[PDB]
Design an enzyme around this catalytic site. Structure first.
Site, PDB file in Angstrom:
ATOM      1  N   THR A  49     -63.076  11.834 -39.375  1.00  0.00           N
ATOM      2  CA  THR A  49     -62.423  12.063 -38.102  1.00  0.00           C
ATOM      3  C   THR A  49     -61.537  10.858 -37.824  1.00  0.00           C
ATOM      4  O   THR A  49     -61.958   9.731 -38.050  1.00  0.00           O
ATOM      5  CB  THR A  49     -63.502  12.324 -37.021  1.00  0.00           C
ATOM      6  OG1 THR A  49     -64.263  13.496 -37.371  1.00  0.00           O
ATOM      7  CG2 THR A  49     -62.890  12.666 -35.695  1.00  0.00           C
ATOM      8  N   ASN A  71     -71.575  15.093 -33.692  1.00  0.00           N
ATOM      9  CA  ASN A  71     -72.500  15.476 -34.744  1.00  0.00           C
ATOM     10  C   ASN A  71     -73.927  14.929 -34.540  1.00  0.00           C
ATOM     11  O   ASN A  71     -74.780  15.093 -35.406  1.00  0.00           O
ATOM     12  CB  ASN A  71     -71.947  15.068 -36.098  1.00  0.00           C
ATOM     13  CG  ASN A  71     -70.732  15.903 -36.508  1.00  0.00           C
ATOM     14  OD1 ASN A  71     -70.426  16.911 -35.888  1.00  0.00           O
ATOM     15  ND2 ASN A  71     -70.000  15.431 -37.500  1.00  0.00           N
ATOM     16  N   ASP A 128     -74.123  18.643 -39.380  1.00  0.00           N
ATOM     17  CA  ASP A 128     -72.784  18.836 -39.982  1.00  0.00           C
ATOM     18  C   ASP A 128     -72.493  17.916 -41.181  1.00  0.00           C
ATOM     19  O   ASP A 128     -71.680  16.977 -41.112  1.00  0.00           O
ATOM     20  CB  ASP A 128     -71.669  18.798 -38.905  1.00  0.00           C
ATOM     21  CG  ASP A 128     -71.577  20.120 -38.128  1.00  0.00           C
ATOM     22  OD1 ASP A 128     -72.074  21.167 -38.656  1.00  0.00           O
ATOM     23  OD2 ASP A 128     -71.057  20.223 -36.996  1.00  0.00           O
ATOM     24  N   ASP A 133     -68.945  11.492 -41.631  1.00  0.00           N
ATOM     25  CA  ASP A 133     -68.410  12.060 -40.397  1.00  0.00           C
ATOM     26  C   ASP A 133     -69.248  11.663 -39.184  1.00  0.00           C
ATOM     27  O   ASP A 133     -69.530  12.476 -38.323  1.00  0.00           O
ATOM     28  CB  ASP A 133     -68.306  13.579 -40.544  1.00  0.00           C
ATOM     29  CG  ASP A 133     -67.315  14.212 -39.546  1.00  0.00           C
ATOM     30  OD1 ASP A 133     -66.419  13.512 -38.989  1.00  0.00           O
ATOM     31  OD2 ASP A 133     -67.384  15.434 -39.252  1.00  0.00           O
ATOM     32  N   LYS A 148     -70.032  10.564 -35.628  1.00  0.00           N
ATOM     33  CA  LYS A 148     -69.373  10.724 -34.319  1.00  0.00           C
ATOM     34  C   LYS A 148     -70.356  11.390 -33.356  1.00  0.00           C
ATOM     35  O   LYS A 148     -71.257  12.104 -33.782  1.00  0.00           O
ATOM     36  CB  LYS A 148     -68.069  11.542 -34.392  1.00  0.00           C
ATOM     37  CG  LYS A 148     -68.175  12.915 -35.007  1.00  0.00           C
ATOM     38  CD  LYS A 148     -66.782  13.593 -35.078  1.00  0.00           C
ATOM     39  CE  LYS A 148     -66.787  14.963 -35.766  1.00  0.00           C
ATOM     40  NZ  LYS A 148     -65.389  15.534 -35.993  1.00  0.00           N
TER      41      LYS A 148
HETATM   42  C1  LIG Z   1     -62.067  23.466 -41.596  1.00  0.00           C
HETATM   43  C2  LIG Z   1     -62.295  21.993 -42.052  1.00  0.00           C
HETATM   44  C3  LIG Z   1     -62.514  21.961 -43.555  1.00  0.00           C
HETATM   45  C4  LIG Z   1     -60.974  21.222 -41.771  1.00  0.00           C
HETATM   46  C5  LIG Z   1     -60.757  20.948 -40.258  1.00  0.00           C
HETATM   47  C6  LIG Z   1     -62.016  20.305 -39.616  1.00  0.00           C
HETATM   48  N1  LIG Z   1     -63.247  21.132 -39.845  1.00  0.00           N
HETATM   49  C7  LIG Z   1     -63.491  21.285 -41.308  1.00  0.00           C
HETATM   50  C8  LIG Z   1     -64.837  21.950 -41.551  1.00  0.00           C
HETATM   51  C9  LIG Z   1     -65.676  21.519 -42.598  1.00  0.00           C
HETATM   52  C10 LIG Z   1     -66.902  22.147 -42.825  1.00  0.00           C
HETATM   53  C11 LIG Z   1     -67.269  23.216 -42.017  1.00  0.00           C
HETATM   54  O1  LIG Z   1     -68.418  23.874 -42.183  1.00  0.00           O
HETATM   55  C12 LIG Z   1     -66.470  23.704 -41.005  1.00  0.00           C
HETATM   56  C13 LIG Z   1     -66.888  24.829 -40.167  1.00  0.00           C
HETATM   57  O2  LIG Z   1     -66.236  25.900 -40.182  1.00  0.00           O
HETATM   58  C14 LIG Z   1     -67.911  24.657 -39.134  1.00  0.00           C
HETATM   59  C15 LIG Z   1     -68.390  25.743 -38.389  1.00  0.00           C
HETATM   60  C16 LIG Z   1     -69.277  25.525 -37.344  1.00  0.00           C
HETATM   61  C17 LIG Z   1     -69.713  24.222 -37.023  1.00  0.00           C
HETATM   62  C18 LIG Z   1     -70.563  24.015 -35.851  1.00  0.00           C
HETATM   63  O3  LIG Z   1     -70.586  24.868 -34.951  1.00  0.00           O
HETATM   64  N2  LIG Z   1     -71.177  22.803 -35.624  1.00  0.00           N
HETATM   65  C19 LIG Z   1     -71.717  22.379 -34.351  1.00  0.00           C
HETATM   66  C20 LIG Z   1     -70.567  22.065 -33.364  1.00  0.00           C
HETATM   67  C21 LIG Z   1     -69.585  20.989 -33.908  1.00  0.00           C
HETATM   68  C22 LIG Z   1     -70.060  19.568 -33.657  1.00  0.00           C
HETATM   69  N3  LIG Z   1     -71.296  19.286 -34.458  1.00  0.00           N
HETATM   70  C23 LIG Z   1     -72.507  19.899 -33.910  1.00  0.00           C
HETATM   71  C24 LIG Z   1     -72.786  21.269 -34.538  1.00  0.00           C
HETATM   72  N4  LIG Z   1     -74.078  21.692 -33.956  1.00  0.00           N
HETATM   73  C25 LIG Z   1     -75.229  21.850 -34.714  1.00  0.00           C
HETATM   74  O4  LIG Z   1     -75.129  21.713 -35.947  1.00  0.00           O
HETATM   75  C26 LIG Z   1     -76.525  22.151 -34.046  1.00  0.00           C
HETATM   76  C27 LIG Z   1     -77.719  22.114 -34.801  1.00  0.00           C
HETATM   77  C28 LIG Z   1     -78.946  22.381 -34.185  1.00  0.00           C
HETATM   78  N5  LIG Z   1     -79.019  22.589 -32.866  1.00  0.00           N
HETATM   79  C29 LIG Z   1     -77.921  22.614 -32.125  1.00  0.00           C
HETATM   80  C30 LIG Z   1     -76.641  22.430 -32.674  1.00  0.00           C
HETATM   81  C31 LIG Z   1     -69.193  23.139 -37.750  1.00  0.00           C
HETATM   82  C32 LIG Z   1     -68.290  23.358 -38.776  1.00  0.00           C
HETATM   83  C33 LIG Z   1     -65.270  23.041 -40.801  1.00  0.00           C
HETATM   84  F1  LIG Z   1     -64.515  23.504 -39.813  1.00  0.00           F
END
Ligand SMILES: CC1(C)CCCN[C@H]1c1ccc(O)c(C(=O)c2ccc(C(=O)N[C@@H]3CCCNC[C@H]3NC(=O)c3ccncc3)cc2)c1F
EC number: 2.7.11.11
Lengths: 20, 337
Positions: free
Chosen positions: B188, B158, B171, B153, B155
Protein backbone atom coordinates in the site's frame (compact mmCIF):
# COMPACT_ATOMS: atom_id res chain seq x y z
CA UNK A 1 -2.09 21.61 10.83
CA UNK A 2 -0.97 18.23 9.49
CA UNK A 3 -4.11 16.67 10.95
CA UNK A 4 -6.28 19.13 9.00
CA UNK A 5 -4.29 18.44 5.79
CA UNK A 6 -4.84 14.72 6.27
CA UNK A 7 -8.60 14.97 6.93
CA UNK A 8 -9.02 17.16 3.80
CA UNK A 9 -6.94 14.65 1.68
CA UNK A 10 -8.28 11.83 -0.50
CA UNK A 11 -6.34 9.27 1.60
CA UNK A 12 -8.46 8.90 4.82
CA UNK A 13 -10.66 6.08 3.50
CA UNK A 14 -9.82 2.41 3.17
CA UNK A 15 -6.62 2.22 1.17
CA UNK A 16 -6.06 -0.25 -1.67
CA UNK A 17 -2.84 -2.05 -2.28
CA UNK A 18 -1.22 -1.17 -5.65
CA UNK A 19 -1.16 -3.05 -8.95
CA UNK A 20 0.43 -2.46 -12.33
CA UNK B 1 12.85 -20.63 25.01
CA UNK B 2 11.98 -18.18 22.17
CA UNK B 3 14.36 -20.10 19.85
CA UNK B 4 12.67 -23.33 21.10
CA UNK B 5 9.10 -22.26 20.60
CA UNK B 6 10.22 -21.10 17.10
CA UNK B 7 11.88 -24.46 16.14
CA UNK B 8 8.70 -26.32 17.13
CA UNK B 9 6.51 -23.82 15.24
CA UNK B 10 8.69 -24.30 12.15
CA UNK B 11 8.28 -28.09 12.30
CA UNK B 12 4.53 -27.68 12.57
CA UNK B 13 4.49 -25.16 9.73
CA UNK B 14 6.52 -27.21 7.30
CA UNK B 15 4.33 -30.29 7.59
CA UNK B 16 1.26 -28.28 6.49
CA UNK B 17 3.37 -26.24 4.01
CA UNK B 18 4.54 -29.40 2.18
CA UNK B 19 1.13 -31.20 2.40
CA UNK B 20 -1.62 -28.51 2.24
CA UNK B 21 -5.17 -29.18 3.38
CA UNK B 22 -7.60 -29.07 0.37
CA UNK B 23 -11.40 -29.27 -0.08
CA UNK B 24 -12.39 -29.35 3.55
CA UNK B 25 -15.91 -27.98 3.12
CA UNK B 26 -18.57 -27.00 0.55
CA UNK B 27 -20.59 -23.85 -0.17
CA UNK B 28 -23.99 -25.31 0.81
CA UNK B 29 -22.68 -25.83 4.32
CA UNK B 30 -22.82 -22.13 5.05
CA UNK B 31 -25.55 -19.53 5.24
CA UNK B 32 -24.30 -16.18 3.91
CA UNK B 33 -25.40 -13.26 5.98
CA UNK B 34 -23.55 -10.03 5.18
CA UNK B 35 -20.55 -8.54 3.38
CA UNK B 36 -17.76 -7.41 5.67
CA UNK B 37 -15.51 -6.20 2.86
CA UNK B 38 -14.74 -6.25 -0.86
CA UNK B 39 -11.88 -6.10 -3.33
CA UNK B 40 -11.68 -6.40 -7.11
CA UNK B 41 -11.89 -10.24 -7.09
CA UNK B 42 -14.63 -10.69 -4.54
CA UNK B 43 -15.61 -10.22 -0.92
CA UNK B 44 -15.44 -11.36 2.67
CA UNK B 45 -18.85 -12.32 4.14
CA UNK B 46 -20.19 -13.20 7.56
CA UNK B 47 -21.45 -16.78 7.25
CA UNK B 48 -22.98 -19.38 9.55
CA UNK B 49 -21.77 -22.99 9.46
CA UNK B 50 -25.06 -24.95 9.44
CA UNK B 51 -23.82 -28.14 11.10
CA UNK B 52 -22.29 -26.31 14.15
CA UNK B 53 -24.03 -22.90 14.27
CA UNK B 54 -20.58 -21.30 14.45
CA UNK B 55 -20.00 -17.97 12.70
CA UNK B 56 -17.13 -17.48 10.24
CA UNK B 57 -15.75 -14.98 7.71
CA UNK B 58 -15.70 -16.43 4.22
CA UNK B 59 -13.47 -14.92 1.52
CA UNK B 60 -14.91 -15.55 -1.95
CA UNK B 61 -12.67 -14.96 -4.99
CA UNK B 62 -13.71 -15.08 -8.63
CA UNK B 63 -11.18 -17.30 -10.50
CA UNK B 64 -11.54 -15.54 -13.89
CA UNK B 65 -10.92 -12.10 -12.29
CA UNK B 66 -7.84 -13.40 -10.46
CA UNK B 67 -6.48 -14.69 -13.77
CA UNK B 68 -7.33 -11.43 -15.61
CA UNK B 69 -5.30 -9.42 -13.08
CA UNK B 70 -2.41 -11.95 -13.06
CA UNK B 71 -2.65 -12.79 -9.38
CA UNK B 72 -2.85 -16.58 -9.65
CA UNK B 73 0.47 -17.21 -7.95
CA UNK B 74 -0.23 -14.62 -5.21
CA UNK B 75 -3.63 -16.22 -4.55
CA UNK B 76 -2.07 -19.68 -4.25
CA UNK B 77 0.48 -18.10 -1.81
CA UNK B 78 -2.32 -16.73 0.35
CA UNK B 79 -4.23 -19.97 0.83
CA UNK B 80 -1.07 -22.16 1.17
CA UNK B 81 0.37 -19.87 3.82
CA UNK B 82 -2.86 -19.31 5.74
CA UNK B 83 -3.61 -23.04 6.02
CA UNK B 84 -0.06 -23.68 7.37
CA UNK B 85 0.46 -21.00 10.05
CA UNK B 86 -0.67 -20.92 13.68
CA UNK B 87 -0.20 -17.89 15.92
CA UNK B 88 -2.48 -16.02 18.35
CA UNK B 89 -2.54 -12.88 16.19
CA UNK B 90 -2.96 -14.55 12.76
CA UNK B 91 -6.53 -15.13 11.66
CA UNK B 92 -7.25 -18.87 11.67
CA UNK B 93 -8.30 -20.64 8.50
CA UNK B 94 -10.96 -23.29 9.21
CA UNK B 95 -11.87 -24.55 5.74
CA UNK B 96 -11.11 -23.98 2.12
CA UNK B 97 -12.63 -25.18 -1.12
CA UNK B 98 -13.43 -24.14 -4.68
CA UNK B 99 -16.20 -24.69 -7.26
CA UNK B 100 -16.64 -24.04 -10.97
CA UNK B 101 -16.46 -20.23 -10.50
CA UNK B 102 -14.88 -19.33 -7.19
CA UNK B 103 -12.27 -19.93 -4.54
CA UNK B 104 -13.34 -19.93 -0.90
CA UNK B 105 -11.49 -19.48 2.40
CA UNK B 106 -13.45 -19.74 5.64
CA UNK B 107 -11.69 -18.21 8.58
CA UNK B 108 -12.45 -17.16 12.10
CA UNK B 109 -14.95 -14.30 12.34
CA UNK B 110 -13.25 -11.39 14.14
CA UNK B 111 -16.25 -9.33 15.26
CA UNK B 112 -14.58 -6.19 16.69
CA UNK B 113 -14.04 -4.72 13.20
CA UNK B 114 -10.92 -3.27 11.56
CA UNK B 115 -8.35 -1.27 13.56
CA UNK B 116 -8.75 1.16 10.69
CA UNK B 117 -12.37 2.01 11.59
CA UNK B 118 -11.63 2.68 15.29
CA UNK B 119 -8.46 4.62 14.51
CA UNK B 120 -10.18 6.98 12.08
CA UNK B 121 -13.20 7.52 14.38
CA UNK B 122 -11.25 8.08 17.59
CA UNK B 123 -8.63 10.14 15.73
CA UNK B 124 -5.52 8.61 17.25
CA UNK B 125 -4.44 6.13 19.92
CA UNK B 126 -2.47 6.96 23.08
CA UNK B 127 1.03 5.61 23.24
CA UNK B 128 0.11 2.76 25.60
CA UNK B 129 -2.78 1.84 23.25
CA UNK B 130 -0.59 1.89 20.12
CA UNK B 131 2.19 0.05 22.00
CA UNK B 132 -0.14 -2.80 22.96
CA UNK B 133 -1.02 -3.30 19.25
CA UNK B 134 2.57 -2.78 18.15
CA UNK B 135 3.77 -5.50 20.51
CA UNK B 136 1.47 -8.02 18.86
CA UNK B 137 2.80 -7.14 15.38
CA UNK B 138 6.43 -7.36 16.55
CA UNK B 139 5.72 -10.93 17.78
CA UNK B 140 3.70 -11.87 14.70
CA UNK B 141 6.46 -10.70 12.42
CA UNK B 142 9.08 -12.53 14.55
CA UNK B 143 6.97 -15.70 13.97
CA UNK B 144 6.30 -15.12 10.24
CA UNK B 145 9.87 -14.11 9.37
CA UNK B 146 11.25 -17.19 11.28
CA UNK B 147 9.23 -19.19 8.76
CA UNK B 148 10.79 -17.22 5.82
CA UNK B 149 7.44 -15.50 5.37
CA UNK B 150 7.12 -11.84 4.39
CA UNK B 151 3.66 -10.29 4.89
CA UNK B 152 4.00 -7.12 2.75
CA UNK B 153 0.69 -5.35 3.47
CA UNK B 154 0.75 -4.15 7.07
CA UNK B 155 -1.92 -1.44 7.66
CA UNK B 156 -4.83 -0.83 10.06
CA UNK B 157 -7.28 -2.09 7.36
CA UNK B 158 -5.82 -5.59 7.70
CA UNK B 159 -5.74 -5.76 11.51
CA UNK B 160 -9.00 -7.04 12.93
CA UNK B 161 -9.81 -6.62 16.65
CA UNK B 162 -11.24 -9.70 18.40
CA UNK B 163 -13.63 -9.94 21.39
CA UNK B 164 -10.74 -9.56 23.81
CA UNK B 165 -9.36 -6.44 22.09
CA UNK B 166 -6.39 -8.31 20.58
CA UNK B 167 -5.38 -8.14 16.87
CA UNK B 168 -5.79 -10.73 14.16
CA UNK B 169 -3.88 -10.13 10.94
CA UNK B 170 -5.90 -10.77 7.78
CA UNK B 171 -5.47 -10.55 3.94
CA UNK B 172 -2.35 -12.55 3.00
CA UNK B 173 -2.69 -11.93 -0.75
CA UNK B 174 0.88 -10.50 -0.87
CA UNK B 175 2.44 -12.82 1.72
CA UNK B 176 5.20 -14.94 0.26
CA UNK B 177 7.64 -17.60 1.46
CA UNK B 178 11.04 -16.41 0.30
CA UNK B 179 14.66 -16.93 1.19
CA UNK B 180 16.86 -14.05 0.18
CA UNK B 181 15.41 -11.48 -2.18
CA UNK B 182 12.25 -10.70 -4.04
CA UNK B 183 11.20 -7.95 -6.46
CA UNK B 184 7.40 -7.63 -6.79
CA UNK B 185 6.16 -4.06 -6.59
CA UNK B 186 3.35 -4.58 -4.14
CA UNK B 187 1.96 -3.08 -0.94
CA UNK B 188 0.00 0.00 0.00
CA UNK B 189 1.59 3.34 -0.99
CA UNK B 190 1.77 4.84 2.47
CA UNK B 191 3.47 1.68 3.84
CA UNK B 192 6.08 0.92 1.11
CA UNK B 193 9.73 0.91 2.08
CA UNK B 194 12.06 3.04 -0.08
CA UNK B 195 13.72 -0.09 -1.46
CA UNK B 196 10.44 -1.28 -2.90
CA UNK B 197 9.72 2.06 -4.50
CA UNK B 198 13.23 2.10 -6.04
CA UNK B 199 12.92 -1.44 -7.57
CA UNK B 200 15.83 -2.59 -5.49
CA UNK B 201 15.28 -6.22 -4.56
CA UNK B 202 14.21 -6.53 -0.93
CA UNK B 203 13.54 -8.76 2.06
CA UNK B 204 11.77 -9.06 5.45
CA UNK B 205 13.06 -5.58 6.36
CA UNK B 206 10.18 -3.96 4.41
CA UNK B 207 7.80 -5.41 7.09
CA UNK B 208 9.89 -3.64 9.82
CA UNK B 209 9.67 -0.32 7.89
CA UNK B 210 5.89 -0.86 7.61
CA UNK B 211 5.73 -1.37 11.39
CA UNK B 212 7.27 2.07 11.80
CA UNK B 213 4.59 3.48 9.52
CA UNK B 214 1.83 1.71 11.49
CA UNK B 215 3.11 2.87 14.90
CA UNK B 216 3.36 6.43 13.65
CA UNK B 217 -0.15 6.24 12.17
CA UNK B 218 -1.63 4.74 15.33
CA UNK B 219 0.00 7.37 17.58
CA UNK B 220 -0.43 10.46 15.31
CA UNK B 221 -3.75 9.63 13.69
CA UNK B 222 -2.23 9.99 10.22
CA UNK B 223 0.73 8.36 8.47
CA UNK B 224 4.24 9.82 8.20
CA UNK B 225 3.94 10.15 4.39
CA UNK B 226 0.71 11.10 2.67
CA UNK B 227 -0.45 13.11 -0.34
CA UNK B 228 -3.36 13.00 -2.71
CA UNK B 229 -1.62 10.91 -5.42
CA UNK B 230 0.64 7.85 -4.83
CA UNK B 231 3.57 9.36 -6.87
CA UNK B 232 3.77 12.26 -4.41
CA UNK B 233 3.68 9.76 -1.50
CA UNK B 234 6.64 7.84 -3.00
CA UNK B 235 8.64 11.06 -3.39
CA UNK B 236 8.12 11.80 0.30
CA UNK B 237 9.11 8.26 1.31
CA UNK B 238 12.43 8.24 -0.63
CA UNK B 239 13.48 11.69 0.69
CA UNK B 240 12.90 10.15 4.15
CA UNK B 241 12.34 13.34 6.12
CA UNK B 242 9.83 12.40 8.78
CA UNK B 243 8.32 14.98 11.12
CA UNK B 244 6.84 13.87 14.45
CA UNK B 245 3.91 15.49 16.27
CA UNK B 246 4.97 17.48 19.37
CA UNK B 247 3.06 15.04 21.58
CA UNK B 248 5.24 12.06 20.55
CA UNK B 249 7.50 10.98 23.42
CA UNK B 250 11.24 11.13 22.73
CA UNK B 251 11.41 7.32 23.12
CA UNK B 252 8.68 6.90 20.45
CA UNK B 253 10.50 9.31 18.18
CA UNK B 254 13.73 7.40 18.67
CA UNK B 255 12.08 4.04 17.86
CA UNK B 256 10.52 5.45 14.72
CA UNK B 257 13.77 6.99 13.46
CA UNK B 258 15.22 3.47 13.74
CA UNK B 259 12.27 1.77 11.95
CA UNK B 260 11.81 4.44 9.31
CA UNK B 261 15.48 4.18 8.43
CA UNK B 262 16.26 4.20 4.68
CA UNK B 263 19.66 2.58 5.44
CA UNK B 264 19.28 -1.21 5.73
CA UNK B 265 22.50 -1.58 7.75
CA UNK B 266 20.86 0.66 10.39
CA UNK B 267 17.14 -0.34 10.28
CA UNK B 268 15.82 -2.03 13.40
CA UNK B 269 14.72 -5.63 12.86
CA UNK B 270 17.53 -5.93 10.27
CA UNK B 271 20.67 -5.80 12.49
CA UNK B 272 22.79 -8.45 14.20
CA UNK B 273 20.43 -8.72 17.21
CA UNK B 274 17.36 -8.89 14.91
CA UNK B 275 14.00 -8.34 16.61
CA UNK B 276 15.67 -7.83 20.00
CA UNK B 277 16.69 -4.34 19.02
CA UNK B 278 12.95 -3.61 18.89
CA UNK B 279 11.81 -5.67 21.88
CA UNK B 280 14.44 -4.09 24.16
CA UNK B 281 13.96 -0.54 23.00
CA UNK B 282 12.92 1.90 25.76
CA UNK B 283 9.53 2.71 24.17
CA UNK B 284 8.74 -0.98 24.90
CA UNK B 285 10.08 -1.10 28.54
CA UNK B 286 6.63 -1.59 30.10
CA UNK B 287 5.88 -4.44 27.66
CA UNK B 288 5.78 -7.95 29.02
CA UNK B 289 6.31 -9.95 25.79
CA UNK B 290 5.19 -13.28 27.21
CA UNK B 291 2.05 -11.73 28.70
CA UNK B 292 1.18 -10.26 25.28
CA UNK B 293 1.65 -13.67 23.65
CA UNK B 294 -0.54 -15.37 26.30
CA UNK B 295 -3.13 -12.58 25.95
CA UNK B 296 -2.93 -11.87 29.68
CA UNK B 297 -2.41 -8.11 29.24
CA UNK B 298 -5.57 -6.04 29.69
CA UNK B 299 -6.56 -4.44 26.40
CA UNK B 300 -6.88 -0.64 26.56
CA UNK B 301 -9.85 -0.94 24.26
CA UNK B 302 -12.53 -3.58 23.80
CA UNK B 303 -15.22 -3.15 21.13
CA UNK B 304 -18.98 -3.37 21.79
CA UNK B 305 -20.49 -6.74 20.73
CA UNK B 306 -24.28 -7.37 20.76
CA UNK B 307 -24.69 -11.11 20.09
CA UNK B 308 -22.94 -13.67 17.82
CA UNK B 309 -23.20 -12.71 14.19
CA UNK B 310 -23.65 -9.00 14.89
CA UNK B 311 -21.75 -6.68 12.47
CA UNK B 312 -22.10 -3.18 13.97
CA UNK B 313 -18.25 -2.86 14.02
CA UNK B 314 -18.23 -3.11 10.20
CA UNK B 315 -19.18 -0.80 7.36
CA UNK B 316 -22.04 -1.73 5.02
CA UNK B 317 -21.28 -2.86 1.50
CA UNK B 318 -23.41 -3.58 -1.60
CA UNK B 319 -24.44 -7.25 -1.72
CA UNK B 320 -24.24 -9.48 -4.79
CA UNK B 321 -25.57 -12.99 -5.28
CA UNK B 322 -22.91 -15.67 -5.62
CA UNK B 323 -23.23 -17.27 -9.04
CA UNK B 324 -21.76 -20.72 -9.74
CA UNK B 325 -21.28 -21.40 -13.47
CA UNK B 326 -22.18 -24.87 -14.80
CA UNK B 327 -18.76 -25.00 -16.49
CA UNK B 328 -15.43 -25.22 -14.67
CA UNK B 329 -13.40 -22.01 -15.00
CA UNK B 330 -9.60 -21.98 -14.74
CA UNK B 331 -9.26 -25.52 -13.43
CA UNK B 332 -5.60 -25.90 -14.37
CA UNK B 333 -4.55 -22.60 -12.79
CA UNK B 334 -6.02 -23.40 -9.42
CA UNK B 335 -5.57 -27.22 -9.31
CA UNK B 336 -3.54 -26.98 -6.14
CA UNK B 337 -5.99 -24.72 -4.21
C1 LIG C 1 -7.05 -6.56 -7.04
C2 LIG C 1 -5.63 -6.43 -6.42
C3 LIG C 1 -4.75 -7.55 -6.94
C4 LIG C 1 -5.03 -5.09 -6.94
C5 LIG C 1 -5.68 -3.85 -6.27
C6 LIG C 1 -5.68 -3.98 -4.72
N1 LIG C 1 -6.34 -5.25 -4.27
C7 LIG C 1 -5.63 -6.43 -4.84
C8 LIG C 1 -6.17 -7.71 -4.23
C9 LIG C 1 -5.30 -8.77 -3.89
C10 LIG C 1 -5.81 -9.95 -3.35
C11 LIG C 1 -7.18 -10.08 -3.17
O1 LIG C 1 -7.74 -11.18 -2.67
C12 LIG C 1 -8.08 -9.09 -3.52
C13 LIG C 1 -9.52 -9.25 -3.31
O2 LIG C 1 -10.30 -9.26 -4.30
C14 LIG C 1 -10.10 -9.16 -1.97
C15 LIG C 1 -11.46 -9.40 -1.75
C16 LIG C 1 -12.00 -9.20 -0.49
C17 LIG C 1 -11.19 -8.75 0.58
C18 LIG C 1 -11.81 -8.44 1.87
O3 LIG C 1 -13.02 -8.20 1.93
N2 LIG C 1 -11.04 -8.21 2.99
C19 LIG C 1 -11.50 -7.55 4.19
C20 LIG C 1 -11.70 -6.04 3.92
C21 LIG C 1 -10.41 -5.34 3.40
C22 LIG C 1 -9.47 -4.92 4.52
N3 LIG C 1 -8.91 -6.13 5.21
C23 LIG C 1 -9.86 -6.79 6.11
C24 LIG C 1 -10.62 -7.92 5.41
N4 LIG C 1 -11.44 -8.53 6.48
C25 LIG C 1 -11.25 -9.83 6.92
O4 LIG C 1 -10.41 -10.53 6.33
C26 LIG C 1 -12.03 -10.34 8.09
C27 LIG C 1 -11.69 -11.59 8.65
C28 LIG C 1 -12.40 -12.08 9.76
N5 LIG C 1 -13.35 -11.34 10.34
C29 LIG C 1 -13.68 -10.15 9.84
C30 LIG C 1 -13.07 -9.62 8.70
C31 LIG C 1 -9.84 -8.47 0.33
C32 LIG C 1 -9.31 -8.65 -0.94
C33 LIG C 1 -7.54 -7.92 -4.04
F1 LIG C 1 -8.40 -6.97 -4.36
Amino acid sequence: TTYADFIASGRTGRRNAIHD
Amino acid sequence: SVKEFLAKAKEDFLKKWENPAQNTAHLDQFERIKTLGTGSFGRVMLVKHMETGNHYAMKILDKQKVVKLKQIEHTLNEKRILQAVNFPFLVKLEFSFKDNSNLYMVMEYVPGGEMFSHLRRIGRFSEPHARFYAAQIVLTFEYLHSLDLIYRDLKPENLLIDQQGYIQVTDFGFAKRVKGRTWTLCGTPEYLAPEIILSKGYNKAVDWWALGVLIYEMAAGYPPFFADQPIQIYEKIVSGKVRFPSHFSSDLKDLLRNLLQVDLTKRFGNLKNGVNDIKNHKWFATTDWIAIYQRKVEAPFIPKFKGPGDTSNFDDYEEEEIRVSINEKCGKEFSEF
